């Protein structure tokens, strides 16, 4: 498998990247607190957004509205309009670093999670927190909405992945499954677009695959090969492949069915912090210690 890099920014450490679903843009959020908006077809910086002190780890566009959300070490979840370029409002509630923030695909909700050991769901019309999901015993490093069902999945340094039932919201927001398996903290978790599969990545240097049904969830298999903390992982949406990204300075591609290594891509000096896939193109982006890259595979 070959990597074809289409865009690269040279900057201080980047922590988050988000693809716009129809414009050729990415947002990048940096460890220095700044947010950039780049056109990856022209290769040019379009806008800068400054509304945080310290690192900004969470960043996401709304899937249809001209909004994006950012989440910071200053505990704020900020909502912005990219046409007016204004910071619209700041959602107050978290009491420690925000690790991830995303929009729901249908409801007017934002999800965020935090070192304060909570996941929060916010309604961006009323500007209120509508649920606080508690139960993790350490930082919650990641949370994601299920692509169709009223479920959330989260990953924590308490070494667990949890799946939450939020149908009551839509107790009420309650843990459905507590997935034990990682023997170290978990840094990331992700749902497959269509199948009942979860992927998680941890400080044990492993990527694990899990399967769920209505009544139960269990560990399927493990991708072994990273030699440092795995920061992020995702399902390739158009091939039976798993992608992972690690502080060992590699992006790895694995076979979804066999869990065997397919390809490794390596940078000489840069730890990887985050990877994402475009919602409608076969385009990927990674954030690392020296900026961001957008790339195709094969």
């Amino acid at each position: 498998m070959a990597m074809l890099t289409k865009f690269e920014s040279r900057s201080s450490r980047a922590k988050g990247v988000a693809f716009h679903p129809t414009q050729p843009w990415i947002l990048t959020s940096l460890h220095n607190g700044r947010i950039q908006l780049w056109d990856y077809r022209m290769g040019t910086l379009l806008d800068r957004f400054d509304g945080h002190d310290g690192p900004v780890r969470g960043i996401a566009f709304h899937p249809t509205q001209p909004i994006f959300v950012s989440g910071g070490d200053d505990y704020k979840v900020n909502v912005w309009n990219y046409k007016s370029r204004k910071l619209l409002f700041s959602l107050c509630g978290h009491m420690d670093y925000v690790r991830v923030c995303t929009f729901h695909h249908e409801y007017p909700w934002i999800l965020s999670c935090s070192d304060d050991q909570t996941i929060r769901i916010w309604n961006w019309q009323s500007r209120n927190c509508i649920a606080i999901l508690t139960g993790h015993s350490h930082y919650v490093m990641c949370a994601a909405f299920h692509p169709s069902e009223d479920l959330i999945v989260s990953a924590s340094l308490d070494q667990t992945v949890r799946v939450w039932d939020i149908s009551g919201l839509r107790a009420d927001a309650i843990v459905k499954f507590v997935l034990e398996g990682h023997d170290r903290g978990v840094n990331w978790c992700a749902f497959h677009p269509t199948l009942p599969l979860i992927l998680s990545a941890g400080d044990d240097r492993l990527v694990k695959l899990w399967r769920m049904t209505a009544s139960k969830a269990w560990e399927v298999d493990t991708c072994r090969g990273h030699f440092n903390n795995v920061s992020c992982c995702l399902f390739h949406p158009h091939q039976e492949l798993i992608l992972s990204a690690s502080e060992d300075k590699t992006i790895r591609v694995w076979d979804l069915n066999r869990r065997t290594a397919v390809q490794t891509f390596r940078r000489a000096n840069d730890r990887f912090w985050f990877i994402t896939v475009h919602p409608k193109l076969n385009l990927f982006a990674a954030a690392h210690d020296s900026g961001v890259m957008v790339f195709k595979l094969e």
């Binding site: 677009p193 949406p237 919602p279 409608k280």
Partner: peptide, 11 residues
């Protein structure tokens, strides 16, 4: 089940 699969791939 996700937006692109439902709008583009399937119908």
């Amino acid at each position: 089940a996700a937006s692109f699969i439902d709008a583009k791939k399937m119908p």
